[PDB]
Every structure is written in C-alpha cells, then in structure tokens.
Amino acid sequence: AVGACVLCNSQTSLRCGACIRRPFLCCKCCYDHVISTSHKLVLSVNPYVCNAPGCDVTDVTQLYLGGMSYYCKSHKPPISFPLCANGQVFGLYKNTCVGSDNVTDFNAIATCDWTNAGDYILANTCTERLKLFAAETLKATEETFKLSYGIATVREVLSDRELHLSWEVGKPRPPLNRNYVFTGYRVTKNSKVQIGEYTFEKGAVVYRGTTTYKLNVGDYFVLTSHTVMPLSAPTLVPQEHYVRITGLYPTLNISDEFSSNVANYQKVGMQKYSTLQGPPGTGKSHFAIGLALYYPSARIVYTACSHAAVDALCEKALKYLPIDKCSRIIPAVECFDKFKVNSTLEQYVFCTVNALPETTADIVVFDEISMATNYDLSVVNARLRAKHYVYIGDPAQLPAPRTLLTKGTLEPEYFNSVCRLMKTIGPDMFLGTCRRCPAEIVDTVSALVYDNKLKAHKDKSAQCFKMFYKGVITHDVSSAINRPQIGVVREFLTRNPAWRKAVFISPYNSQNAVASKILGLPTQTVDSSQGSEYDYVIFTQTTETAHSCNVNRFNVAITRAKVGILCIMSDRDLYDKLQFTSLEIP
Amino acid sequence: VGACVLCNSQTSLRCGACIRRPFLCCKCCYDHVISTSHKLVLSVNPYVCNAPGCDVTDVTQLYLGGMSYYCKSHKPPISFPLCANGQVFGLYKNTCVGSDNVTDFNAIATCDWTNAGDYILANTCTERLKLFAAETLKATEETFKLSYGIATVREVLSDRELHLSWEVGKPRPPLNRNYVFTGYRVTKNSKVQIGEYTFEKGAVVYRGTTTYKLNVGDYFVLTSHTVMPLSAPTLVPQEHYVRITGLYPTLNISDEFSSNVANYQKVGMQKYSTLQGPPGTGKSHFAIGLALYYPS
Amino acid sequence: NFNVLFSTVFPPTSFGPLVRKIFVDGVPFVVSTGYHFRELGVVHNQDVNLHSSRLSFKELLVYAADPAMHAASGNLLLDKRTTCFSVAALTNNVAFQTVKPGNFNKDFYDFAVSKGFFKEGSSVELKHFFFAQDGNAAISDYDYYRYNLPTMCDIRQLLFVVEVVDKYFDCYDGGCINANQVIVNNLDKSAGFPFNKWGKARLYYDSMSYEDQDALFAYTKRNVIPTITQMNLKYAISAKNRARTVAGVSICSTMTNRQFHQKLLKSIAATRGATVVIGTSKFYGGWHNMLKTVYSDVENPHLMGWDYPKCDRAMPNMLRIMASLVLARKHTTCCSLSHRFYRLANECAQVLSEMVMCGGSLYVKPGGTSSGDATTAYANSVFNICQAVTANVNALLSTDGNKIADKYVRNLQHRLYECLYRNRDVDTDFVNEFYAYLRKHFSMMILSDDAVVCFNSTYASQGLVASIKNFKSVLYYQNNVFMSEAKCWTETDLTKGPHEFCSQHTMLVKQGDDYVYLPYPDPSRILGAGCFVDDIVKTDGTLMIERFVSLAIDAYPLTKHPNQEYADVFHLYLQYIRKLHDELTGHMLDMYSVMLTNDNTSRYWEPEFYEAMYTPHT
Amino acid sequence: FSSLPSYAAFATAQEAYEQAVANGDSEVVLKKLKKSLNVAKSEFDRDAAMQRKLEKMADQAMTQMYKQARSEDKRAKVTSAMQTMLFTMLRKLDNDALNNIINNARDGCVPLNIIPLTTAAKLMVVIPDYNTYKNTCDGTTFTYASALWEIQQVVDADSKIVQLSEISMDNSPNLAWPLIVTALRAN
RNA sequence: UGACUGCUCCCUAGCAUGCUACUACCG
RNA sequence: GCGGUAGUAGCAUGCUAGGGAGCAG
C-alpha cells in the first residue's frame, strides 16, 4: 500500500481520499493540498477519522492522535498529539520527502472539475506526470458524466429499425449515435444476459446497429462504464534522431509507386516519434503500407482509436502487403479478421488498443489522432515499445466529443500532445501526394488552415455549388431538425439529378433519419466517417451553432466528396472567404 | 575473522567503500577510513540501525544499545556511540596496533588504478600490502573489461562475415587479439554456448576456436570469474645455498649450449634465477640443457 | 457402526470426495462438493456457487488446499510396494528420502572417560543413538497401516461406556471462541502441503484478518473441505531403529480446529487433581502430588501400567469418532446441531481418512489417528479411558454371579445387565452409581496414554474389576492387536512408586525431614544425550553452555540414588560446566584484553541451585 | 530537549540569578533567585518531561504501522502466486475424455479416485523386485485399468536409464531396485 | 523435508506496583 | 514544624511480548 507521490516522487503512503482516484501524496505536499482546498480526508494504511465509538469528524488538521486510535477534540485521552503539524502530516517516511513549489497545478486539477476548455488548457499545460494523472481523473469525470444517463430499456419490440425504448426515471436520455456505442443486456430473473452492441437512433426507435439479436421485453441497453486504469507509461516518449538508421535494416530496391514516402520512411528510420502532415485521404493508407515493404524486416503495429477506423488500413493490407505475416486481434464489436487471431510474433500486426496484449516492436503507426485522448496515447505507450513511432492523420480535423466542455472551444493543438507538437516543433513529416481532392479544396485547405503545403491537385469538374441563404432553426431534446433546410433539400435538388443519388450529411442525424422518409439519402454522422465517405455527397447546415460554425468542421466536410457536394454554408462564419458560383433559389 | 594487512592483528571489520572490502582492524580500521572516503563498515553483521524501515549509512552516526544497533533518529537513548575514542568498536577491541603509514596503505587501496602513479604507489608498499595492491589491480582491470557489450549476431552471413550489433549503447571493445569473444547461444531459457570465438573487423570477421556455426540473436562476451587472494612471496626467500647439495649432479652435459652450465652452476646455488636474456639467446635452450645437467 | 460393516461389500474406488466441473469467470475447474465416508454415508455441500466472476481470498485458499485439482491433474500411479490404495502422482520422478546419523561430541567423551566411565562391566552403558535409515524408509513405514482393519464395535455397550467416559470429563467447560482470543505458540512451523512453498504459518496468520478467519470458521460449519497432509521423518535420539513418522496437517485445518476446541483444551491444561494429568508439572513437588492423588484411598492397592502396541495406526475408527463426540458435547448453546454435524464430518474428512502425501505422490490413509492434528493428546486420553471402562464392564459381567459374596456388587451386576442390554435410553442415576464405585476401586491417572491404575486388589483377584488378562482380551477383539504380557508391570508395593510412567522411575527420597517422590530418568539416556548431537554447533560446548544446565536439571535426582555410578553422572555434569566456563572466560580474555568481572555464575556449578527445583515452593 | 518554549523563561531567570550572584546583594536577592529558579524548573517539570513521552508514543505507533504495511504487501504476493499456480495447473486437465465422463453422470458428481484412473494419459508404476516385475509390466505392453498401456522407458533409484533387455534373473542383482516404469496410454 | 500439546531454565525489552533516596513547591 | 504533590535516580515484585535451549507423549 506504499508508493511514490504523484508530485514529489518521494516515497510515501498518503492518499487524498477527497479526490475521486485517490492519488499518493507525499507528506509535505499532502499538507500543501489539504491547506488551500476542501480536501479534508487523507487515508494512509487506515482512514484518518476519529474512530471514537460513534464519532464522525473527518479532518486531518482537526484530528488528534490518541493512544492508538484517532481522535479530534472531544475524544482524545490526556495523552494526545497534533496530527497536523510542522507543515508535515504524520505519515511514513516523514524524514524523506522533497516537497515541491509546484502545488497550485495539483490544487487546480483537484479543484477543476472538467467543464470548460480552460480545463483542457490545464490538461495539456502541466507536467507529464500531472497531465497523466489529469487525463486519468478526466476519464473518472467522464464515467460519472455518461453513466449519469438513463438505461435504454426497450420494453416492446415493434419490428426492425423501430422499437419501444424506455429508460430509468429522470436519469437523462443520451443524444444520438456514434459517441454512444451502446451494448444492451436482457433480464432473466436473478441475472442478466447478452443482447448486442448497437448504435442508437430515435423513431418507435429506429436503429442502425453494430450487432443483432432477437430483441424481446424489458430489453435494457447501456453505455457500459469501465474502470480507467492507471497510466503507468507516458503518452509519448522523448525522441532523438539517430546517427544511423539503426534498429532498422536499409533497403536498396523499393517500389516507387510511393515517391515521397520512402523519403519519409528514411527520416522515421532515424527518429523515434514522428507524424505526417497529410490532408484527409492522401495515401497514408498507402504510406505505411509501402513502408511495410520498404524495410522488409521490421515489426510494425497498425492501430487507430476505433476498430471501424482501421477499415482502409485493413483493406489494402492483404492486397499490397503479403498475406502471411499479417495479424490483427478481434475481441469476441466484430472487426476485420482478414488477418489472424492470436499471433503476436508476426512481422506485420494490426489492431486497436481496446483489445491487444502487452508487446514490443520497432515502428508504430496510429491513425485517428485528431480525436485522440492523452489517456489513449498513454495506453499505447504502455502496451508496446518500439524504436520509431508514427501517428497518422492531421491535427486540423474533428476532435472527439469533449462533452464536458460546455463553454469555450478546445483548440486543435490543444487536443493531445502531438497536436501542440506539430505546430511549435512543427510537422515531423507530411504527405503532399494528395491523391484525393480537385483544385478547389486543395488550395482552400492550404491557404485556409493547412499551412500552404498542398498545391492544386486535379481539375475543377464543377458540382459543389453554394448560396447566400438563411434557414430557420429548431431544436428538441439534444438534436436539431431544420424544416427551413429539409424543404431546401428538394428546393436545391430541383435543377440537376447529379444531386439525388448521393448521401445527406447532417450535424444531428435526426434530421436525416426523418428526411430520408421524404427522399431517402443515408444517415451519416459527421464524427468518424472520414475514409467511409462518398466521392459525391450532399451536406446541409441544419444548425447555425459552433458545432457547425468553427473553422475545422467544414474541412472535414468538403474534403469528403470528389468534386461534388451541396455546400449550403448559410451559417454565419465561413462564407465570403471561399468562392463558388451562387445559383439562386429556383 | 582474519588479520588486517598492516597490523598482524586478527580483526573482524570490513571497510565499506572499497574493492573486495578488505579486512581492517579497529583502530587501524579507523586510520584507513578517517583518512579517505570510506563511510560504512561491515563485520559479522553490517553496521546499520535495525530499527524497522530505518535508513542509516555512516557508522559514526550509529550507537549500539540492546542486542542490536540503532541510530540517532531512531535509537533508544541508552546509547554507546560506536565511532568513539578514535577506535570503532568491534572484536579484538584492545589488541590492535594501528598505524600512521596508512594514507600510503590507503593510497594503495585508494588509488583508482587510473594512474601510472597508482602503479608507483603499488611500488610503494610491502608484501601483504603489495599482494593487496596486485589483487586490487586485477579487480579494477576486470571491472573495466566488463564495461563493453554482448556481441549479439542476429543475421548470419558467411563464415567470418555477419550482421552484428550489440545490446544497448554499451561501448565497443578494442577488437584485437585481447578479447576472445566467446558466444553463449539461446535456445529456450538459458544462455548456453555459441562457443569460444575471436572477433575482428569484417560482414564481421570472427575466428572460431572450435568449429562452430552461428545462430540468431545469440551473442558473445568474455565472462569473468573470481581472482582470489594469495599467500607466499612473489619473489621467494632469496637464499643462494652454501652449496648445491642434495641433488644428482650428473657429469654428462649436452654441450651444444656452451653458455648453459655457465649459469646452471650459479642457479643450482641460488633459489630464484630471474635473468636478463634476449630472445632466442640460449634460454629456450637453457632449461632443456639443464634437463641434461639435471635429469633428476 | 452399521455403515462400517455394510461398507466393506462395496468397491473402494468410489469413496472419497465428489467433484463437479464448475465454471469460474467462464473457465472450468473441478472442485470438491461433498464426501462419501465409509461411515457417515453421503454428505453434500451446502454453499456451492455454480458460477463466479471473481474468487476472493478465503476462496483461493479453500480451492488450493484441495486434493481435487492436484489429483484430477496428475499422472496415474500404481504402487506395488504397499497394499494401501494409491491414487495419483504429481512429479515425474519419485523422491527417496533418507535420515543421517548423529554427530559425535568428542570432548565430552574424553572428559567422560577420564572420570572413569565406560569401564567394561559398568552399569551405565551407551544405548540411545541416532539411528540412520536408507532410501525407501518413508514408505516402508507408511505401510504399517495394513494393521488397521474395518472393525464393527459392539453397540449396546458402547452406548454406555460413552456415558461413563463423559461423566469423567464433566468438571470442565468449553465452547466456541472468536478469532481474537485464540493462542498460538511458535508461529514459524510449517503449513502443510499446498502452502509450504510460500512460508510458515505466520504468513497465513497475518494476511487473513479477523473477520476473514471468522467467515472461514463459520463457513465450514455448513460445508466439507477435504485436505492433504505431508508425512515426515523424525530425527531424534532413540533406542530402536524403526524410524518415526509424524503427519504435518495443512493450515486450514488447524486454523479452525483451534477456534473450535481451544477453550476446552486450555481448560484441561489448567486443572489440578483430576484424572487426566496433562499440564501438571513434575517440578517443585508436583510429581509427589500426582502420585498421592492416585493412591487416593483404595483399600489394598497395587499398581498396573500397560501399553498398546502400535497405538496410532491400529486404532479403529469408531473409537476415533466416539472421541470427537465426547470432545464436542459441550456446545449445547454455542452451536446448534447441523452445525455440530458438519463440524464432526469436517474432522473425519481431515484426520481419519485424508490423502496422505507420503513422498511425491498422494495416497489414501485407511483410518487410525494422525498424530499431528490439533487435538491428539486429548483424543488419545479419552480413547484410553474408553478401554479402561470397557475392560471393567467385561470383567464385571463375565463372572459367575452365584459365588459373589457381597450384596452390593451382586446388584451392581444385575442392574448393569439390565441397563446395558434390556434398555435403549439413558439412566443417569445408575451411571452415577457406577462411576462412584469405579472411582472407589480403580483410581487412574492418564497422560496421553501412559497410564497408571492403583486398583484395589482383593477384588481384582475375584474378578470384580479389571486385571490385565482383561485388557488382553479387550485389546484383542476390539482393537486387533495382541498385548504381549511382557510390557505390563505390577508393583505390589507402594513405598516405591510406579515402575515407570512417562518413562521415569520413582524414588522415595527423604529430603528436608520428610519423604517425597523425586522422579529420575535413565542414566544411559542422559549420557547419550550428552554425547550425540545434531548439527556442528551443538557439538562445540562453549557456545551452548545452556544445554548442560538443563541436562543437569534433569539429572539431579540421581544424586540421592543408592547405586553409585549414577551419582557420578551428576557430578560429571557439574564439573563439566565448570570446565566449560572457566576455560571460556580466560580464552576470551586473551584475544580480548579483559573478560568476566561480575559473576554469580558460580551458582551453576554447585547443587544448591539445582536443588530448588524439587522442593515445593514456587 | 534543547529548544522548548519555557526554556527561554528558564534562561532569562537563571541568567538573572547569576547576574545577582555577580552583584551579590541582599538576602531577598536569595528569595528571588530561589523562587524564580524553583518555579522556572517547575516549568521543565512538564515541558521536557511530557513531550519526551509524546515522542515515545509517536515513533512507536509509526513503527507499528510500518510493520502493518509490510504484512499487507505480503498478502498480495501470496495471492498472486496461488492464483497463477491454479491458472497454470488447470490447463493440463485434459479437457476431453473428462468432458465426456462428467456429462454422463447422474449430476456432475463423480468420485475423485476415478478421474485419473480413467482419464489420465500416463501411467507410472513402481516395482520392488524382479519376481513381481514379471507378473505385471513385462514385455513392451501390459494392461491395467483395462486400457492398453505400452512401456516406453524405465529408470531406477539413481534415476538413469536401463534397456528392457537387461531385467532378467541373472542381471537382476545389479539393478538399483525399485525400478520405476513410465508407460503411456495406447488406444 | 522440520506436526500438535504440555512443563522448565537462561538473556534482552516494556508496563504496573511497591520499595527507595535527593531535590522541590504548598499548607 | 507535619503533611501535600511533582520531577530524579535505586531495588524488588508481577505481567507482557520477542529470543536461545532442554525434556515428555
């Protein structure tokens, strides 16, 4: 029950039980945090409480050692002792502790309850140790936030994609789908049984799930909690460029289907942590894929934050790469097993941290970084060890549902570490072979945010059109339908059929699940569909809020298509900065 | 339970920061430690406060007491400070002589074996102390010779050419004939036998002592052992006998070596013949012509 | 009793535990869930959980102290050395274990001959040595169980001998205690099979808190836990070469038999003046008071030791049960009933039929006491009183009651038959009448089976009480051994005490101005223990002047003896301590430069110290 | 013990007493010096006389809780070991023939002393001497428990190997005799 | 590899009690 | 003057715990 303190590294045994996670506190710093805060319980190999017969008082400062129990004022026998004293609460190794001027940060994170972006300014802005402990408490705040939601109990089963779904009393109903990968269970009598993992929509509750069942009565569904576990390893390792490409074996011949990809395999062969500044969809799914053949003797680990994000990485694997030495574990959501189950020692390996054993490699690929948490990166650095490391994507995309943010926005470079690292240390790498987008959005990203490194890719083939419209908003529980946009659907779908055979992007897919009853374009969540997008789509603003009105939501919205999607950017931020033709209402 | 090296006194202490941690004697121990950086002493048990979880390193700070040792920040008051009276308490507490010639004694032990001056200082002592200096020499050598890596060959190439690396960072050896870099292969759990080799520059040229093959991830060192203390004098008790008596002085000598008996007669009347003779100068012939001057 | 008979007929590969594959965290094990004894029929567990996501600590324990996992995962075994039904095997190489010889202690030997001991012809002569044993001694000693047969015991007289034994054990008191009042001396003694790879009883007496041990002990009062048991070779001086072997039960058997029995146990080992004499010192004039209680008043006494040949392996199983049913008759309130039964059954499953692990290879142990549990030395005592009473009932019925002269033992035998056979329920009136007669003409005194019995005589010469042909009969037909009438003495005199009890004769010396019964040992024993030690540290004497003091404390009453060379043993010991000291002192003076200055060690080598311990005052 | 509160009162009062001995005035100076001293010593009567028992109590309780943290780590070590032993000793349970012989019983309950006797996949038989060796494990196969066993190696006391050629009557009394035969289950 | 239980000696530690003197301070 | 109580040693008794060793079944 002993260990280092979360601030002084000083071997101790005090546990600030007033927090949620109970960190280990050095004596002196245990003082420092008990003083200027309401942390008024500290546990050692016991709890500090006047265990008089029927007392209750819980204050370290206020408690007096009495004989062998503990006492406050009205309990101590004549022989007593100020527990609080000397600026050093009474715990083991009272004579070995370094203290630390750095205490206001701890007081903060203990006091800061994760509600604004300033909270995340904190999380990114402290010590590796302290942001690590932070991220852990962050996840604690999240498990108390989200399991504070109702229990999706379908009492009646109507059909397919429509159910009578109920909850517990008062405990709120979640919003929509992707941030809410549900997993329901059914009663038996004394215990529970499996049901399936779903994604939840309204009606009657229409659904489009990840698993199935024979759904019955009382069928309750939850966003099951877990236990965020300690983050022993850091999030990232401090790198160095090596004098040689050691640990890796140079190749001489190489397929130059990937030109400026060997030029970066070379620099990562000599540097540990690294990442490309390559726009959405630019052959990263060809980059590390060609790398796998580049050094035909290296251990690569393929990962992202979501098992359904490793789609592209999993497709062309068994195409480009050889079929034998590739591997990816699938936990019993069902994921891509076109590799193999349980086979760590295979030169090529894939999967996502949600399920994979402890290991060690040489090169590391990690997609899905803009929506990453420092908690995850920590997991990664804890699950494996390698010589060089590559994180895939770009920061300037969408971040994960930072849901406890209810005010100021979180800036991109402030998402996780690499985020602040790719603009101030700069891009370790970058992809410019931007085989995806035409001439519009390439220069648009370049002179918009994406630091003018991407040139005009291919031709302006004319399909994305834009207006100067308005559109009236309406809300409900935690989503938005927009009749002054659901009418505009057909109102624009009038003049050319090259619109009708598309998809209907939406901020809150209630609008799509309803307007598909009119037409029938697919329900798509804007969150994590990058790489699972069509070359020709339709988008409608539906809402004029920051969830739509930022600067980075539309760069993950106009990148998706090839040369065609309805850009109704009637929202009041980004309009008279990009240029299109303005076809009036007809 | 033996003697310090300059007091012919059985003692039982053992200096803290040294090489082998040598035997020292109460007062003599003091004259070793208090004149250098030695800050702990070991006995039948080591001298450290056995108040549970305590942490005490300098002998001075401790105190005896009940059937144990203690310390200022932990002791019972009924102390008895050890490092007292100029003589740290331990068995043979009385019969000890100590010495002032210790910073030379120490110099011999407190020479980091970096200097040719340290060699002069090893040249600056006597028999107990000189055998001591020699063993300290050997030990410092050996603790430096194990400062390199373990020559792991991962990819086999031709005989006397491979793709060799190492462990991590640990420095590169003077790869000449000094190091017989012998291999210990790994099969399942144990480090066992690539064999005895000798590595040179390749593609890495080795020299397989016995006929050997190479594997994968299996590596090469020169694993050390235990140089031990000695006894009798390096130079014998020199005494040129009054005569060459008690041997079989045969008459018939192979005279091909006409400088051989010209010294055989002086050696048969002399314990130690440590001679100056240039290479191939009737020396390799010397002892084997003695084999006829003395076949018995 | 009946089941003991009707259970020979069935096969013997169908006794022992049961099992059943349970699934913990979606993984299957095997776990015991009952038992099948040869007597108590089938017995089903009561708290079996067909699933579990996580096992705690009490669990982990009671699953790693079980045979089922080890056996059910091990290579079969056929053992052609024994007859005992082997079971399984764990290792791949069986292990053969041996016993070394003693160590000679020379300096005591030369010093012993200097004073003129060991003159060929003397009356003291070396005899107790450290005997060696070869390889397969462990198992050729385990084998001796084949002297243990299934026995039916007569019943309409066992259900009366059990009243009278209970009446003996009546002045005492006992009950369940809690996990904070148990007392356990010497906390670094081994923990038995599955656990002794990790540490001594200490470590499992810490990690388990107080409410743990209470959950555990009030748990196995509705369950059954089969257990293993090592087997060990003693290493100690002796007069015979057949090695001795002692069974080291595993922790979770003691760690509950304690809390169960402790109070009755420690309330026998603290009463003076009864029948059992466990816990009564012989020093400071205790021995005299023993031998003067025994001779309570019986009109024309004698004495009458005896001994059971192979006592702990030839014991039937009905008598071990009866022992436990008299040691657990006090809980009329602390425990209910099915609680008392699952406790008895837990005893029988642990120390009357367990799975001896003699070697590297489980076996099966048919019956008879295991002499290393947590209630031997009293179980044996109550079994012993059992044999004494039933010898009395045989001796009293089987008499031609037409020649009996009195008119009170005539009616005693009449109603003894009535209440014995023609009755079904108790009669505590007559149990009391008997036990009164029996303690007026047959006083006893009983350690852990070395008895003494100052019977009236002119009865036992007309067969109105036991004799020793009667213990012969009873041992024969109810224990199946032949008690050779050549280890059973009979002092016809009392001014000399008992020829031997606890292996110590008894001399009526005249000290102070009055007469006491000091108890002396066996000169060869004391000498032998002087000369032969285990370990080379026992040897050197100066380090261990603390043995010779005790040995001299035990070798004192020899000084008053009539024969000579005896007394010289004592004086040898005194002069030897003196030499040891006054040599150590100077010896340490030289290499020092001082030594001993404050003495009154001089009390160690004069007899007025050693004499205090045999005069009544402390 | 040299820095307590009332120490200052004592210091001033008795430095003043010595200043009065430096002047050497009245006998009422003695009245002062003898009521001040005794009262100032009546101070330390309590200061360095109670806090010295407080330090006893303090360091004592501290060492007790040190010992307790030790015991509590030991609990964790033993649990981890017991657990890994179970979860490595289960894997050889042979989960097939077992699976059959259970799922046929009246209800899961099948006395233990038959699980090895019908599902174990290796015999080990110990023989004392030759004359008994013949009447069982002779040749290269025998049968016992009515499955067909086939010898495959033989050791002895000293744990070495003998070839089944050697166990006659003549070469018998050179065999460390409790030969230990290690068969296999043949179908 | 080192079983349960009982009695006994010897050396430390701690508590209590008393015994104890020398100092105090008050009446 | 006599007692008060408080600190300081000193002795004895007893109880506690930990250590070493001996004997009996």
Ligand SMILES: [Zn+2]
């Ligand atoms: Zn010296």
Ligand SMILES: [Zn+2]
């Ligand atoms: Zn200390």
Ligand SMILES: [Zn+2]
């Ligand atoms: Zn009870």
